[PDB]
Design a binder for this molecule. Structure first.
Ligand SMILES: Nc1ncnc2c1ncn2[C@@H]1O[C@H](COP(=O)(O)OP(=O)(O)OP(O)(O)=S)[C@@H](O)[C@H]1O
Ligand SMILES: [Mg+2]
Lengths: 192, 333, 192, 192, 131
């Protein structure tokens, strides 16, 4: 069940849900495993907010263990294409594609909760079939791994070699460690 | 006076709106030239030509009707449609305002026929009561002997010879116009998103306005028909506000400077200071209306101390003074 | 089925459900196993209440055996971030993540029913794979265990060593015992 | 859940969803595996947009790994039949039928995201039964393969022989390579 | 005080004033509610201050009273809460001294009355020294 909130305005009472009310304030939610259906929904919300006001910042809370890499790339392109700066805040956890999107936000506007955790790992795939087909798929996944590493180094500011070594295996970093690594900028502990 | 003469005089008091000045000047000249021909030798009757003004809030739509009216000795009155003016529970009928116009002309109905009654905020009564006001206003816009009986014996003057000018700051009208003539979507990668702080093309788009657009906005077909003449006003850009500070004859800078000249102290505003005031005025969204308030407050501190201070020849205001970093420099002498 | 209640106001009759009606009075419900979807919903409700009034207390009834630890951490951060004090009341039971959130409420505003029960236990996890990967996951779970113990001692006021020993195995404490332990402050038996 | 957005108009407030709001602006979405049900829905949207305005362009975002070939052919015919030019933009990925529809857009109006990927492969099928029936099905799939290759060469501008050789096995091409191959025209990196 | 400092002509028209009337008044001198510091000053400095009005009132029967400094500021804050401006100062002092005027004339051998912050706050009754 989704609670239905009511917003008081000059025109009159308006009916909205919990998610819709926050969306009107330029807020987006990224919950559940990343896939084509959910990823497309997020992209649509970003486009709508840009048309309404191409200057106000668009917030996006990332809380998911990850999902399809291809479905996650579409969201990244939309964030870097729309003129409004996308502010990403990590809530709960952000692993696999979630971590990549966390550092993809506009510089100086990346935040995370004090107890939030971010995990980064190399791309995961796999193909079965003839030898020739397996070779093509192996090259495809390798290319995606290199592109992802370059993008990560661009935001976090670390060297390309450092990112590759740290992505060889799952790496868990707490909120304080994320700031030093470069994934996020500051930590939102209490409202001031 | 011919339309050319009217244009020359009006451009001195108000700057910009070249297109609106051409259509407005011709409309008033055609209506008044018909009234002057009271004899009407030709059997053909002369019908009124109501004017319609469309433009963003603060563009000077009201100042165009009032300033143009001052050029002539005819009386001019104003009304507001936000109160749902009507002879009943809907609101207060503008008929009382009509009598006010009559009072200005030494309470002479003969001269009251040349009224330029203007109704502002006309776009606020658009149909979504709203439609009720428009319906009751259809007859008033055209000839109608019925009106509030004056108390100077009770007469019944007709509202056919009095010119009616309806103008309002239509909100969202530029969106419907774009969706009609202009192509492209408003949402999506290929959509042509209009920058809020840049590419102020709203004025140009308004020029391509047709009666069909007003129909969708909410105005009933009868109301649109009553207003054959249509005019558009372009938004004043940051540079436009700068010109309004000096180019207008009765500009804000000229008024304050003249006031200080009475005591022998002359103040001069440099080009750098004028642009500084214009940039902050745009952010406030008050338009030209807020220019007088911001400028007066900036020089209010020194104006109060000017009469008391002695040994003063001429003061000057720098750009930093507007920002509050320093105070107007004074040249002792 | 969710009963639909009607609230009488000056404007006129308004349509609302049982959960929505209580939400308007700054009341939130935490039912079912904790997960990413339900946890995100609770966080949204807290943010909406803060915007409406950043001073009125926000109630939250905890009734669940627990769930994903990462999902629960997001709710804890939101409670400690929003200016309004979050009052947590235990109804039925509060175990695993439920117990942690029960003691996370504002000091002096934690309550529990006379027959409510609270259970606390160490984090539960598990990973399978190569030896190197297993070592990384083992260290991650251990770090989470230490952080949770420190937070528990901060609210209940007990020593860090005491919390660790009591968390080695499941511990069931009744409502009267919860007050002494420090998880809650008082017990709401009857309305006075 | 689908967020419900509200559009401000002179008539009054209007209720719409995220997908419906974009549809009003001549925008269509193609997400999920291509099938008869989803394909029919897309065709219906194109017809409605044409009736409203047979001159304004109709956008269509392709984000899917592919699906039934027969279902995809219906969408291709509709795009080439309706007078309005259909602009196709690849988001996330476009493989199998997705790639074919990406290059089927009006010349000079094909775009793709910087991180988008397009994959092209020969038709996939298979039949079981008597020898005579297997022969008929084998000829049918072969004919479909030839027709698809000819259409691809018409848009991309490449030779028929080149398309056949490249379609013998899965081929992954990044966004920069898609422009050179002819599938797309330009790449939309940032809004200008 | 800040809301009134920023006003626009549309606000006056919506209130009821005819639009022409607003234009005729280019100058708009907006005032602000008296602050706590201003209330205390108006409570003592003015020649006709209510504080001295009550002092002269008791002089009819031969009694006088003095208001402590710690009590003047307390009365000012209470008046601000009433949101009645300077008019609230008279009401507050009247209620505090209501009991004093109810039994003072009846009592005999009264010399002076001392009122502090506690007396006005209701914590204790006004002090009185016989003589
Ligand atoms: N072109 C202009 N030249 C000089 N002064 C101008 C000009 N446009 C606006 N102003 C000034 O700005 C003030 C406000 O502009 P107006 O459009 O007349 O206000 P308005 O029409 O009453 O706004 P609405 O429609 O009631 S919300 C005028 O009274 C002028 O002092
Ligand atoms: Mg006006």
């Amino acid at each position: 069940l989704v609670p239905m909130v009511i917003e008081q305005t000059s025109r009159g009472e308006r009916s909205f849900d919990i998610y819709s009310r926050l969306l009107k304030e330029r807020v987006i939610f990224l919950t559940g495993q990343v896939e084509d259906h959910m990823a497309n929904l997020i992209v649509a919300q970003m486009l709508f907010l840009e048309a309404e006001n191409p200057e106000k910042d668009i917030y996006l809370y990332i809380n998911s263990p990850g999902g399809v890499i291809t479905a996650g790339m579409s969201i990244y392109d939309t964030m870097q294409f729309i003129k409004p700066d996308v502010s990403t805040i990590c809530m709960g956890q952000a692993a696999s594609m979630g971590a990549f999107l966390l550092t993809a936000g506009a510089k100086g506007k990346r935040f995370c909760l004090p107890n939030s955790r971010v995990m980064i790992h190399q791309p995961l795939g796999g193909y079965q079939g003839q030898a020739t087909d397996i070779e093509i798929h192996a090259r495809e996944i390798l290319k995606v791994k290199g592109r992802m590493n370059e993008l990560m180094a661009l935001h976090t500011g670390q060297s390309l070699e450092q990112i590759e070594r740290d992505t060889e295996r799952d790496r868990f970093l707490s909120a304080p460690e994320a700031v030093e690594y470069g994934l996020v900028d500051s930590i939102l502990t209490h409202r001031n | 006076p011919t339309p050319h003469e009217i244009r020359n005089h009006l451009d001195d008091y108000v700057i910009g709106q070249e297109q609106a000045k051409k259509v407005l000047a011709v409309a008033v000249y055609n209506h008044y030239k018909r009234l002057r021909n009271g004899d009407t030798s030709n059997g053909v009757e002369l019908g009124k030509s109501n004017i319609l003004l469309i433009g963003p809030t603060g563009s000077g739509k009201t100042l165009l009707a009032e300033t143009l009216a001052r050029l002539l000795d005819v009386p001019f009155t104003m009304a507001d449609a936000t109160t749902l003016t009507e002879a009943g529970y809907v609101g207060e009928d503008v008929e009382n305002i009509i009598q006010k116009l009559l009072q200005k002309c030494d309470y002479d109905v003969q001269k009251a026929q040349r009224g330029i009654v203007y109704i502002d905020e006309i776009d606020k009564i658009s149909r979504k009561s709203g439609e009720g006001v428009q319906q009751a206003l259809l007859k008033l816009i055209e000839g109608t002997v019925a009106a509030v009986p004056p108390q100077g014996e009770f007469l019944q003057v007709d509202t056919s010879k009095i010119l009616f000018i309806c103008g309002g700051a239509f909100a969202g009208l530029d969106k419907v116009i774009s969706h009609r003539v202009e192509t492209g979507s408003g949402i999506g990668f290929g959509a042509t998103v209009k920058a809020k702080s840049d590419k102020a093309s709203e004025g140009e788009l308004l020029a391509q306005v047709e009666p069909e657009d007003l129909i969708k906005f909410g105005l009933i077909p009868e109301f649109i028909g009553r207003l054959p003449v249509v005019a558009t006003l372009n938004e004043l850009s940051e540079e436009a506000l700068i010109q309004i500070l000096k180019e207008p004859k009765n500009a804000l800078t000229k008024q304050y400077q003249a006031l200080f000249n009475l005591e022998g102290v002359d103040l001069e505003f440099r080009d750098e200071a004028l642009d500084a005031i214009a940039k902050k005025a745009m952010a406030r969204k008050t338009g030209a209306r807020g220019l007088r308030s911001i400028v007066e407050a900036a020089l209010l501190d020194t104006m109060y101390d000017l009469p008391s201070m002695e040994d003063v020849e001429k003061v000057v205001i720098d750009e930093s003074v507007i920002d509050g970093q320093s105070e107007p420099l004074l040249i002792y002498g």
